[PDB]
Amino acid sequence: PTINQLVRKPRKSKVEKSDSPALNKGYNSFKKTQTNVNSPQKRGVCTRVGTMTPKKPNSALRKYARVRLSNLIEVTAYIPGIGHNLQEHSVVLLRGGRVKDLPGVRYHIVRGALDTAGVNDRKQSRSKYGTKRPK
Amino acid sequence: AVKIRLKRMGSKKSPFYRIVVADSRSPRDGRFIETVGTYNPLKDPAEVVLKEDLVLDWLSKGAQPSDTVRNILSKEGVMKKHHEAKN
Amino acid sequence: ERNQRKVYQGRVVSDKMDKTITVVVETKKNHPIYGKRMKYSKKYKAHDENNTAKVGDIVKIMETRPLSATKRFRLLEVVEE
Amino acid sequence: IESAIKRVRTSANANAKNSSQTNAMRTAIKKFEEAVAAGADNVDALYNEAVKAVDMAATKGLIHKNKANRDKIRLSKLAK
Amino acid sequence: MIQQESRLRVADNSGAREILTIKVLGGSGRKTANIGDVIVATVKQATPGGVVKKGEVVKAVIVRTKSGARRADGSYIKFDENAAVIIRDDKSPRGTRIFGPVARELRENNFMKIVSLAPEVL
RNA sequence: GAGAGUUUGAUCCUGGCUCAGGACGAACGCUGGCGGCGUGCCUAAUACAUGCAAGUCGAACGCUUCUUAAGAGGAGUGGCGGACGGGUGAGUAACACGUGGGUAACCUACCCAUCAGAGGGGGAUAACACUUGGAAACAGGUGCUAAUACCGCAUAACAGUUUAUGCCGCAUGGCAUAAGAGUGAAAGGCGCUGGUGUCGCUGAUGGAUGGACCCGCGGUGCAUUAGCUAGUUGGUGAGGUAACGGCUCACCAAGGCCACGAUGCAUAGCCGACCUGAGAGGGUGAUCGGCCACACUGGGACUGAGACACGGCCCAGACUCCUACGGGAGGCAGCAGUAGGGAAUCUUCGGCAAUGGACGAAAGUCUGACCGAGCAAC
RNA sequence: GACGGUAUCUAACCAGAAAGCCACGGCUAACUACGUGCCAGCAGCCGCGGUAAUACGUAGGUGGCAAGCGUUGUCCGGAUUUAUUGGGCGUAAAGCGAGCGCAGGCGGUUUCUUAAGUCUGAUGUGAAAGCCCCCGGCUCAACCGGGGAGGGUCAUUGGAAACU
Ligand SMILES: [K+]
Ligand SMILES: [K+]
Numbered sequence A: 001p002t003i004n005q006l007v008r009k010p011r012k013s014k015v016e017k018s019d020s021p022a023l024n025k026g027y028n029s030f031k032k033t034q035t036n037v038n039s040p041q042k043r044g045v046c047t048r049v050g051t052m053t054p055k056k057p058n059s060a061l062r063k064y065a066r067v068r069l070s071n072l073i074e075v076t077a078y079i080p081g082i083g084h085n086l087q088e089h090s091v092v093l094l095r096g097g098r099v100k101d102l103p104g105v106r107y108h109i110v111r112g113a114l115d116t117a118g119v120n121d122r123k124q125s126r127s128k129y130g131t132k133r134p135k
Numbered sequence B: 001a002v003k004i005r006l007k008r009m010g011s012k013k014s015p016f017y018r019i020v021v022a023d024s025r026s027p028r029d030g031r032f033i034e035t036v037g038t039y040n041p042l043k044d045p046a047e048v049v050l051k052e053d054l055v056l057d058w059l060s061k062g063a064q065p066s067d068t069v070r071n072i073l074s075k076e077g078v079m080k081k082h083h084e085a086k087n
Numbered sequence C: 001e002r003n004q005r006k007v008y009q010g011r012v013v014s015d016k017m018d019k020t021i022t023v024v025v026e027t028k029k030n031h032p033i034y035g036k037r038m039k040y041s042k043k044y045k046a047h048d049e050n051n052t053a054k055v056g057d058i059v060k061i062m063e064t065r066p067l068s069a070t071k072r073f074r075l076l077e078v079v080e081e
Numbered sequence D: 001i002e003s004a005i006k007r008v009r010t011s012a013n014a015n016a017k018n019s020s021q022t023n024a025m026r027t028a029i030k031k032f033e034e035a036v037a038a039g040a041d042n043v044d045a046l047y048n049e050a051v052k053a054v055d056m057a058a059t060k061g062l063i064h065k066n067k068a069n070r071d072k073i074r075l076s077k078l079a080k
Numbered sequence E: 001m002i003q004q005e006s007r008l009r010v011a012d013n014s015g016a017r018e019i020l021t022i023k024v025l026g027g028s029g030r031k032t033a034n035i036g037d038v039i040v041a042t043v044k045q046a047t048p049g050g051v052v053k054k055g056e057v058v059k060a061v062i063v064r065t066k067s068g069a070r071r072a073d074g075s076y077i078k079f080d081e082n083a084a085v086i087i088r089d090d091k092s093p094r095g096t097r098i099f100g101p102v103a104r105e106l107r108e109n110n111f112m113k114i115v116s117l118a119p120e121v122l
Numbered sequence F: 001g002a003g004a005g006u007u008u009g010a011u012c013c014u015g016g017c018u019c020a021g022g023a024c025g026a027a028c029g030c031u032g033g034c035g036g037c038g039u040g041c042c043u044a045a046u047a048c049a050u051g052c053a054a055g056u057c058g059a060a061c062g063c064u065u066c067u068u069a070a071g072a073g074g075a076g077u078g079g080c081g082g083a084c085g086g087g088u089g090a091g092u093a094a095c096a097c098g099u100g101g102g103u104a105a106c107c108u109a110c111c112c113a114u115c116a117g118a119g120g121g122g123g124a125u126a127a128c129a130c131u132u133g134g135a136a137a138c139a140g141g142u143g144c145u146a147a148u149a150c151c152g153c154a155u156a157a158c159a160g161u162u163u164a165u166g167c168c169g170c171a172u173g174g175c176a177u178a179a180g181a182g183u184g185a186a187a188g189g190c191g192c193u194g195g196u197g198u199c200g201c202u203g204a205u206g207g208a209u210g211g212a213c214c215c216g217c218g219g220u221g222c223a224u225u226a227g228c229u230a231g232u233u234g235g236u237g238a239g240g241u242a243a244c245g246g247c248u249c250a251c252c253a254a255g256g257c258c259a260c261g262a263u264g265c266a267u268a269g270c271c272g273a274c275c276u277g278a279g280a281g282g283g284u285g286a287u288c289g290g291c292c293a294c295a296c297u298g299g300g301a302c303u304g305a306g307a308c309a310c311g312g313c314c315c316a317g318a319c320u321c322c323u324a325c326g327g328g329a330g331g332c333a334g335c336a337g338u339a340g341g342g343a344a345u346c347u348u349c350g351g352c353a354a355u356g357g358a359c360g361a362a363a364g365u366c367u368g369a370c371c372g373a374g375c376a377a378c
Numbered sequence G: 001g002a003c004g005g006u007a008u009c010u011a012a013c014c015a016g017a018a019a020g021c022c023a024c025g026g027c028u029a030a031c032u033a034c035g036u037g038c039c040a041g042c043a044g045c046c047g048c049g050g051u052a053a054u055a056c057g058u059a060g061g062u063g064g065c066a067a068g069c070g071u072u073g074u075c076c077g078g079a080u081u082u083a084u085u086g087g088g089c090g091u092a093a094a095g096c097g098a099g100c101g102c103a104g105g106c107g108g109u110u111u112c113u114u115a116a117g118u119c120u121g122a123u124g125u126g127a128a129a130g131c132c133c134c135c136g137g138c139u140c141a142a143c144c145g146g147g148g149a150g151g152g153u154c155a156u157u158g159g160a161a162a163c164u
């Protein structure tokens, strides 16, 4: 471009965006608007717990939960690990991160936080999946 | 009132002070016009640094120190010189 | 001796007003990023004492107290009809 | 609440007195203006009474000295 | 002399703004009401951000009327509008603050909280 | 100013995705010894239970209670401070901020320096005593009383104004002198021996201090926002403010702003600075400091040097609280703390010993500013 | 003198009361065994798992950090991936279908002139704290303090004018 062009219209950068828009918003019941807040984790209520079939190179029953967030955005997350204490209406805590198998799951569920029971008999990579030491 | 006082610096339980020219309306640490020395008693005696010319100029222009600063300026001989210059 | 209040040189663009005119300065700042020498046609309102100045005429103006809401400047000269 | 009650009371009394004295000043001045409109020879003494009230209001914290000066100057331009 | 399909203003902050009498309570064929008489009603106009909202069916109390009230001593009260207060099953109100004046006739009918919350009680 | 992996059977380009590093007011999980230094509602400027945060002066004044006429305590009047300090950042896209300037259009209690002066009089009022108001806060009525409270009388204009000169400036104009006309001040307390010294009192100047206004330039997105304004633009008068000016009113004219982005919409406190980066730049505006704005929402004034006032007044609205149901009262975005929201971020602690501030002659009283301590591996 | 009989110093005693987190297919430092058998599950990207898995889970072992470690979320960088520094348009993304022309952008040689741009001397200011340099005190360090340096498409005045 010519410098005249670059003054008549400047370089307008490639607009960016997040891999987790649901975490980057909030809600005040008074004015009832999306409040933009950069929150690492959130709370939600599992509105469904089920299984899904992953993409073609893989084959499995991937455990998901559809969840109703504090900010009233409904979100599909993954239940990592082996086993869960979850049901519909079960309070849950959510963190970010894709699950490359299904597309519609941009989020993960956290273990050891709330009604989510810690994983059972997991001794390695233990902070992850949230289960206390075997003494 | 325009005043010549001392403002607090340094960590807790290890204080230090800067003599300073401050209005009484400003905070303990805030607006100031000029610094004219500094102070700490953390030595076995007290220990002092001063700027005689500027502090005497503000005293002439109408300053009004606090009690401890008056003691310090007495030990450094500035109040006596101001008195003499008024005589 | 006392200070000297700011003065500018410029050009007239309208004289349809009594005891007053509009004056244009035409500096040239460099665009901050790309550096090109741009135009910058700042303009002002000047108090004329006698409706002397004519359109498209070079002029000098010194600041002063607000003589109106827009006015801040005082005519000094008339240079090139 | 916190010892502001006394300032409420004193400020109301001050309001009373100050508004009274300003109204006195303004009645004197208006009286002088009407006298200058009526052309009576009492203008000479009413001028002085107006100036008197203006400066006595500059005293007692009703009137800033610049306002007093502007009033005196206006009255002077009326009389002379 | 408040009847069915008779519209009323609201004298509290419950959320409602205008009311319509569905029926009068008390007896079988009561076709009329006055101060101290409970009402069943709708809500035809509500405050926007209000608890009580459009269409709701709710009980209410008549607190002031043009066809006013009478005292033993011949002293009569009257008003320039017909207004009511929304209540629960208990005699207590839905909202918290009553507006305008109120008749004394309610103290006999035991709407004492409304009598208290009202600023002026005539 | 280091790159790596990944499209292909493989290759080179193009092009995107991800990773390698640094930093959080951080949160979650697992674990967990100590010390030092710092930081700790980023969300609901959401609502506030409780407690404490602005009082002081008896050497301004008169009462009242206890002191064998002493000192000490209660409420008075008066003065000073309450406008600082502290909190928050909602609004604000503009002289709000930053920077550089200007004010011959300005103001300034307290603090300094100087020239002067501080005379003689008057009428009240609280408090207090009775009265009604009855739960009592309130409130009203009669009477008495002091002051550095208030009033006006006496003199000065050194203040301001006009004339005459001089001088100079950047036009308006400003400085020095003289003259003219008219105006205005006050307060005493403490101590010494009428004279007094000290603190206060009144006028004028000058300085300092802080404040007010004005201008150049600069800093954010949209033109799927192109027209905008009518006291708006200017002028002659008048009024008004500490002061300039449409700041305001009348009258005269129809001008003025904008593609160099006006107007509108959205967003946002700005800055020093902080993180990153070879730099150019980007992103942020927490803690500390500066300017601004706000004090339940909106408006308005009074007092005062200073407010259109966080812990002051009036009114309207919303919201809540106590009532003996007659009527009152309140405003934590002060420090702690509660509820709620939230992914989530503190003890309902001690002291004014320090430092700073108010008041006071001084001791000293007050001070959730501040000093410290406490909790949290932040 | 609230802190506080705290800091601090002395002496007696016990190895005794005091280490975990993540990762180990490649990018990336770090490898085997067993179970499981496209299931369970892993996964920042490439992708592992279908009876012999260094990619799941456990055990052992090792590596990187360490009273912390890891993970999410946010900002920068790498990303020259909005290119002023510092990119491109024949086929990859992109030359409007083409022209006439208002505004703007740019513009032949040359004398004289100016001095808006430009260059330049001096003066002032750019608060303090902070970054950086030299010092000094906290058992060192963080931190704290002193001094200095720098910071402005900044402003006034004074020159040149080659170039626009
Ligand atoms: K803001
Ligand atoms: K407001």
Ligand SMILES: [K+]
Residues within 6 Å of the ligand: none
């Ligand atoms: K494994």
Ligand SMILES: [Mg+2]
Residues within 6 Å of the ligand: F277
């Ligand atoms: Mg770079």
Ligand SMILES: [Mg+2]
Residues within 6 Å of the ligand: F310, F311, F332
């Ligand atoms: Mg408050």
Ligand SMILES: [Mg+2]
Residues within 6 Å of the ligand: none
């Ligand atoms: Mg390897």
Ligand SMILES: [Mg+2]
Residues within 6 Å of the ligand: A125
């Ligand atoms: Mg794993």
Ligand SMILES: [Mg+2]
Residues within 6 Å of the ligand: G053
């Ligand atoms: Mg195997």
Ligand SMILES: [Mg+2]
Residues within 6 Å of the ligand: none
């Ligand atoms: Mg193509």
Ligand SMILES: [Mg+2]
Residues within 6 Å of the ligand: none
């Ligand atoms: Mg600095």
